[PDB]
Design a protein around this nucleic acid. Structure first.
Ligand SMILES: [Mg+2]
Lengths: 130, 53, 46, 349, 124, 136, 69
RNA sequence: GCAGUCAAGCGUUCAUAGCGACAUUGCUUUUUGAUUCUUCGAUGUCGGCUCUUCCUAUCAUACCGAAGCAGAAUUCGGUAAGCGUUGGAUUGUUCACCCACUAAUAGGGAGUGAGCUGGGUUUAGACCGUCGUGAGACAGGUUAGUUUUACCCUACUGAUGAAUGUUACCGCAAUAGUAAUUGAACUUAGUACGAGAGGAACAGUUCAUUCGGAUAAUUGGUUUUUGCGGCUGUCUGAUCAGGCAUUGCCGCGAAGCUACCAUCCGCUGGAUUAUGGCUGAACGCCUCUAAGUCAGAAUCCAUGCUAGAACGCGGUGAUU
RNA sequence: CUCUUAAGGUAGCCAAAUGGAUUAACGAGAUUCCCACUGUCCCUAUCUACUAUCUAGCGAAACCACAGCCAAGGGGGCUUGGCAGAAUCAGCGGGGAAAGAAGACCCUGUUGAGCUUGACUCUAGU
RNA sequence: GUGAACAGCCUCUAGUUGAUAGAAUAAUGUAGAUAAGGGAAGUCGGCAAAAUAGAUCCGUAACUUCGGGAUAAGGAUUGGC
RNA sequence: AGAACUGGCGAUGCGGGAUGAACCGAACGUAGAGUUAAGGUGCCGGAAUACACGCUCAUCAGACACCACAAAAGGUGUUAGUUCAUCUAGACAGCCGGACGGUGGCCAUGGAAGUCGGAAUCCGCUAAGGAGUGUGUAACAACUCACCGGCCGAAUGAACUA
RNA sequence: GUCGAAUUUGGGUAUAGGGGCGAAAGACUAAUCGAACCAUCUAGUAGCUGGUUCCUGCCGAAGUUUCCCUCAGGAUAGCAG
């Protein structure tokens, strides 16, 4: 799984292609690769620019933009591909939560681990790493 | 008035073997998951006092 | 639309039948029996 | 539309609404599917199911968005009346929440119809369809209170009297128990309670009657009190708005009898406090229950208070009583005469 | 004509691309304005003749006179009639084919055969 | 069967399939009517709806005044051109198909109808009989 | 269909360019799409182009480029 | 979906060891119908012409309860598949929506991939753009391109046939099927309902849509009656009278056939689903239910009709 | 190491008639639309010549494990039921390792070659 | 002979009566036709039929390489003595 | 899903589960008598429409793999049990009366008196009586219930398990 | 479609197999052409599909372990006599 065998051309023999079947954080500066060099595919409908991170403290939950995929287990080449898959850690813009580290340097980012499987629903829930 | 079709009662040998395999699987699962006051004298007995002594 | 088998229209027709709807058939059968007796007498006369 | 919007789609509580929607989706759309079916078939099945549920929610919301009066830009009279009745701001906030839930259900159905195409397994499409139906239910779950408020205002707004402000009208006014309800009962066929207790009519009443080969609609109003334009209920404010927004010879009934135990000086004070409203209305005062008082015997000091009513040129102190209806015909004749005299002058200009 | 996009190369460092023409829908799309923009094929319009009057709203009369070169029209009905007569286009016995001449008029308006342009906004 | 018609209409042969052109029969200024639907038409698979004399029908103004164009309006047929069996016992047919546009209530639009009008249409629409200067 | 093709060519293009008819560039604008390119993809340049200058007087195209500059 | 709260219960201390039904809090794009001029990679084909049959998760028709149902109109819910569930535009594509009628244009299975059809399993031709030094395919698109029933067997629709001693006539019916459906003009009535705006229902009448069975009384169509009359080329010497021009053509054209393109017809008794009651305990009250029982749906069974067991049957005439 | 933006009112400066490729004619090439037109359709009906039908004479072909009534269960035959009366004639195209055909489409060959190159070994010619 | 013509048809000299046939004219087929009213609403698609067809005269547009378009288009007539 | 071992098939007949790769029985030369397993004893089908004790009316129960996913409960459809309470100084139900007075308690006011709106909810006398469980008026009124008293009388009520 | 021309065609002759010819389709080359036919090597190559013929009695297992880059191809312990 995780790699659909796309087929192309009048004769679908080689097909020269694969496509991810799961959500991915493509990044702000994607700028789609030209199709002739395009082997892997991350269709935009599966992409998400935000995740429903929840802070264990105070019980609050807030929708915040995703920032980067830090550590994906199970062949972190998927982390290079940005896949979440129910457990991948992801950086998030925690500035909305009001977190402020000691010394007056206000925080604006914190790690978070996705919990819900992206494939089974369009929301990307995650528990904040306090 | 217009009687509707009734479900067949036939054993459905295929379904029988499948239910047997599902039962063995459920038994294995219940066994794997297993690792995780006296009533007293019944009322209305004629001789409740005799047992006390 | 009401069905041809509908009980309400059939009961209404049964109620309507009691009057002229039956009297006309009665007078028609009486005239037919009279014409039959006349045809019988016309044959018996000869 | 206007004039008694009885065509409202009979909005239902959000729980029953979500139940009817889920039932219609389960019943109309195909249900059976099997793991061995081609994945494209299961995908089209779940897509048709989600699209049917979303279209049903969109229709259920659009029917309410379209059938409601749209208080704004209807008429100042109906606008002020519905504001006094249903708390216009809350009436707008409820329909705004309805439109917000409709747009949310639309965005959810679209995002899930887009995400559903990529499902590689029957369980994934099933979880996606369940997620869409649950998002639609949660959007409906927050709409319960606004939907109940809309169901209440529909039950109230659908029984409001028909009226066209441009059409000829004659308002009636006076202290409670004065017999103004009896005057409306006598001047027209409209039925109204005439019980002795003060506020026999808690809301506006209307009653058509022909005259001079022309239609007319008497409009009783639910009483008024001498208060400093702030200590008043919606009923009294709804009555004052009916006078302010309706021209053509509002009637100010009065009763000198000991019944309706407010001193006649208080009636003159109320007539003075309401005087500015009648700057163009061509006031026609109408004493009531004359048979039991016959103000010809009235004390000269109390009669002087009537002279203060005469300071405005347009007043006419007609006499009338329920026990002698023949004078009521003369009052209606004078009212229609002043009405035609004003309208014909307005038309020639 | 551009049924689908196709990749193209030049200098090996850049790839040209093209897509079918986009028409952002809006309530102000003023269908006849969609026709004057050329977005629609004139052949399929049910009533080509009814769009004729609007072509005069843009093109100057002197250009339409110099080009055709039929002139002297008013209300554009005499325009279509005299044009169908001078061009030899007519339905049998004997009415002019105002619709077919209107099709050629709209085609010339879309292809630029008749000059026309909106006035640029005045300089500050 | 249609609202606004006085009395029930007896069956007569159809002769105006949807999309049929018919000459205008009134002074409204339309030159011809192009039928697009027939009110009361019997639904059936593969069966094109068709009209008959005196039937109401929606129709666009294929030719005439531009203001009447680009909109469909109800119209009552005043001529069929197809043979039909009158109950009196003689076949007849109009020289050409004709009709008149009208409001859904059936009130006539033009001040008068030009040309002969069929008896079946005038009997069904009293306003058409009032606007018809020649009955048959 | 053409909308999906437009989104595909936009995502795949490092630098979108928007041609405009010289006869009426203001009417040729694809408004609501340029806002999407500005928001979702700020990096995209979306440079304007003004073709068919031959069909309009050169001063008209000059004023058009001066206004769109 | 994610994070969280009470606990009706469970469980060796005991819910605070752990779980936990029914509920509930915070997010998924704005509380003044403001916006929502977003439509974002289905790698795989689905969709359509004639037509039979089946299901309810029922759009309509039929019978009911509730809903601020005064009326009309409308919403939900219970039964109900007996009959209906339409004519088309869009391919700079169509896993779609629009107008218009109709009471309604509800959802599904066998589909019919050798009944036919476009998109397509599209090999041999070619061109445009990409890759690759090249051979060639490919991130594409366009164009044109032979898979051809049965007389075999069986199923179905029609049609013969020895065997009830012979033949002929009149009959009964177990069996299988079944059909009629929907709409609207008078009266009720401008009445109840309404202050008005308009606006019922039942009985009594009358027309219409779809479908089914029939006939040419009248109209249209059809001509090998080559029936009559005419026309062209050619031939029998001319006239008359005749042959060929694949029924040479034309005008009419009977008989037959045939067209809602003409006309007639398509019914009257019981048992029932939901529902509303009776009496009446269970339970010293109550209760449409436990017994019995009344009314009631287009439902079921019957009336009627279609064919009649070729091995179901009766009566009657002759019987060398 | 500095440094990039002026064009004006319906046709212009112009280059030694025109500023054209948006090219005329031509095409069993493909595509969009209009008049006439008509049974493609509403809605199908009729006529003629020859087959198809019986008969006089002659007389095959494909296929054939055997022959062919169905419902359910069996991870056309087997099991339980409905049924079942010789021999047959004409339509028929629902089904039969029934013909006809089934291929296209997927996979492995150590096997055949049409082709290409700074793949390996050779080589006419130079 | 008819006919612009060795275009189509009949006839002259000359050569043939050879293609298995008899009996009716079922369904369904191959070939040739007709049809009241609409005239493409059928079909992916005007697939096939139909419509103008010869001749005399009026008249014939855009474009153009000036040669062509062109029988453009659209109109009046055709018999016999 | 990944490893070890014990077994049937493969190579396997025979009886039963209507038949079946696995189920139960079972040591395959040709026959007779006799005794058995699984499985049955109303017919097809050889054998009791046997005995003794309990539950089942299902508008398609049941003979079903059912000690397995729907399975958590819901049924005023039945039967047997466990626990907690009242009682001849009167158990449930049944019929009648009381259900009192500061009082129309304190806050909103055209009006809320228990019952259109908010925070308390006592004393006084009783056998008891709630600033009030519901019906209904503009309010009241009135009806009614929680509990007591008046009349027959004896077992009655609630939560769970099977 | 063309039918006065790069027109059609009779007879003769020349081009004959990794060759001939080709207004170029891998098209033609005697019903065969991305390489024709005839006789011999030749009964080629078998990774593989198919088959493998009379009777009776006794015994009678197998799908498990190592060794090549490695499927493949096989060698090896083991099982029975
Ligand atoms: Mg009063």
């Amino acid at each position: 799984e995780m790699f659909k065998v796309i087929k192309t051309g009048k004769s679908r023999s080689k097909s020269w292609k694969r496509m991810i079947t799961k959500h991915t954080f493509v990044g702000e500066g994607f700028t789609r690769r030209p199709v002739k060099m395009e082997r892997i595919i991350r269709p935009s409908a599966l992409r998400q620019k935000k995740a429903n991170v929840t802070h264990p403290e105070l019980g609050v939950t807030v929708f915040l933009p995703i920032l980067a995929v830090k550590k994906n287990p199970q062949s972190p080449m998927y982390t290079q591909l940005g896949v979440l898959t129910k457990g991948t850690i992801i950086e998030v813009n925690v500035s909305e939560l009001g977190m402020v580290t000691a010394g007056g340097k206000v925080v604006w980012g914190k790690y978070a681990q996705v919990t819900n499987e992206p494939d089974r629903d369009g929301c990307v829930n995650a528990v904040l790493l306090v | 008035m217009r009687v509707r079709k009734r479900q067949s009662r036939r054993t459905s040998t295929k379904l029988k073997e499948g239910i047997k395999k599902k039962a063995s699987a459920h038994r294995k699962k219940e066994k794997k998951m297993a690792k995780k006051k006296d009533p007293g004298i019944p009322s209305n007995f004629p001789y409740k006092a005799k047992i006390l002594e | 639309a009401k069905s041809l088998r509908a009980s309400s229209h059939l009961n209404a027709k049964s109620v309507k039948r009691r009057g002229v709807f039956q009297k006309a058939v009665d007078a028609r059968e009486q005239r037919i029996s009279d014409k039959l007796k006349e045809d019988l007498l016309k044959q018996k006369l000869e | 539309m206007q004039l008694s919007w009885k065509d409202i789609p009979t909005v239902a509580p959000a729980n029953d609404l979500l139940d009817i929607v889920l039932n219609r989706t389960q019943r109309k759309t195909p249900t059976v599917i099997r793991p061995g079916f081609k994945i494209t078939r299961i995908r089209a099945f779940y897509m048709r199911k989600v699209k049917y549920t979303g279209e049903g929610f969109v229709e259920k919301f659009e029917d309410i968005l379209k059938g409601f009066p749209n208080i704004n830009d209807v008429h100042p009279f109906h606008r002020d009346l519905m504001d006094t009745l249903y708390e216009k701001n809350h009436y707008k906030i409820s329909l705004a929440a309805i439109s917000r839930a409709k747009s949310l259900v639309e965005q959810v159905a679209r995002d899930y119809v887009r995400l559903l195409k990529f499902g590689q397994s029957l369980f994934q499409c099933k979880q996606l369809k369940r997620a869409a139906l649950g998002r639609m239910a949660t959007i409906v779950k927050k709409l319960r209170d606004p939907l109940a408020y809309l169901e209440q205002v529909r039950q109230h707004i659908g029984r409001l009297p028909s009226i066209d402000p441009n059409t000829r009208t004659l308002l009636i006014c006076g202290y409670p128990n004065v017999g103004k309800s009896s005057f409306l009962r006598c001047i027209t066929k409209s039925d109204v309670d005439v019980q002795p207790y003060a506020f026999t009519t808690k809301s506006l009443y209307v009653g058509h009657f022909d005259y001079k080969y022309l239609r007319f609609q008497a409009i009783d109003t639910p009483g008024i009190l001498d208060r400093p334009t702030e200590e008043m209920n919606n009923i009294e404010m709804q009555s004052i708005y009916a006078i302010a927004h309706l021209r053509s010879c509002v009637l100010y009934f009065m009763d000198l009898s000991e019944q309706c135990g407010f001193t006649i000086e208080a009636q003159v004070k109320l007539f003075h406090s309401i005087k500015p409203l009648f700057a163009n209305k061509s006031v026609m005062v109408v004493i009531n229950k004359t048979d039991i008082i016959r103000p010809e015997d009235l004390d000269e000091e109390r009669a002087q208070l009537l002279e203060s009513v005469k300071e405005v040129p347009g007043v006419e102190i007609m006499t009338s009583s329920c026990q002698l209806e023949e004078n009521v015909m003369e009052v209606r004749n004078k009212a229609c005469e002043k009405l035609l005299a004003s309208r014909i002058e307005n038309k020639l200009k | 004509e551009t049924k689908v996009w196709q990749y193209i190369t030049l200098m090996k460092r850049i790839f040209l691309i093209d897509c079918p023409g986009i028409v952002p829908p809006s309530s102000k799309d003023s269908e006849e304005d969609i026709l004057f923009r050329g977005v629609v094929r004139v052949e399929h319009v049910t009533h080509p003749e009814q769009y004729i009057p609007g072509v005069l709203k843009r093109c100057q009369v002197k250009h339409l006179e110099r080009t055709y070169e039929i002139s002297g029209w008013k209300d554009a009905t005499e325009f279509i009639e005299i044009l169908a007569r001078k061009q030899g286009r007519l339905l049998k016995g004997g009415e002019p084919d105002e619709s077919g001449v209107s099709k050629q008029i709209l085609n010339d308006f879309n292809r630029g055969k008749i000059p026309w342009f909106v006035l640029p906004p005045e300089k500050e | 069967s249609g609202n606004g018609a006085q009395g029930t209409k007896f069956r007569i042969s159809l002769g105006l399939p949807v999309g049929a052109i018919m000459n205008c029969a009134d002074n409204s200024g339309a030159r011809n009517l192009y039928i697009i639907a027939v009110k009361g038409s019997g639904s059936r698979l593969n069966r094109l709806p068709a009209a008959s004399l005196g039937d109401m029908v929606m129709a666009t103004v294929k030719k005439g005044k531009p203001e009447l164009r680009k909109k469909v309006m109800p119209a009552i047929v005043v001529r069929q051109a197809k043979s039909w069996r009158r109950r009196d016992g003689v076949f007849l047919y109009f020289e050409d198909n004709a009709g008149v546009i009208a409001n859904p209530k059936g009130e006539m639009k033009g001040s008068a109808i030009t040309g002969p009008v069929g008896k079946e249409c005038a009997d069904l629409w009293p306003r058409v009989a009032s606007n018809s200067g020649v009955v048959v | 269909r053409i909308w999906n093709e437009l989104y595909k060519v936009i995502d795949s293009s490092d630098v979108v360019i928007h041609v405009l008819d010289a006869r009426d560039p203001l009417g040729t604008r694809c408004k609501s799409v340029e806002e999407y390119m500005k928001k979702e993809t700020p990096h995209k340049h979306l440079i304007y182009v003004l073709n068919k200058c031959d069909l309009v007087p050169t001063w008209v195209a000059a004023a058009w480029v001066k206004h769109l500059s």
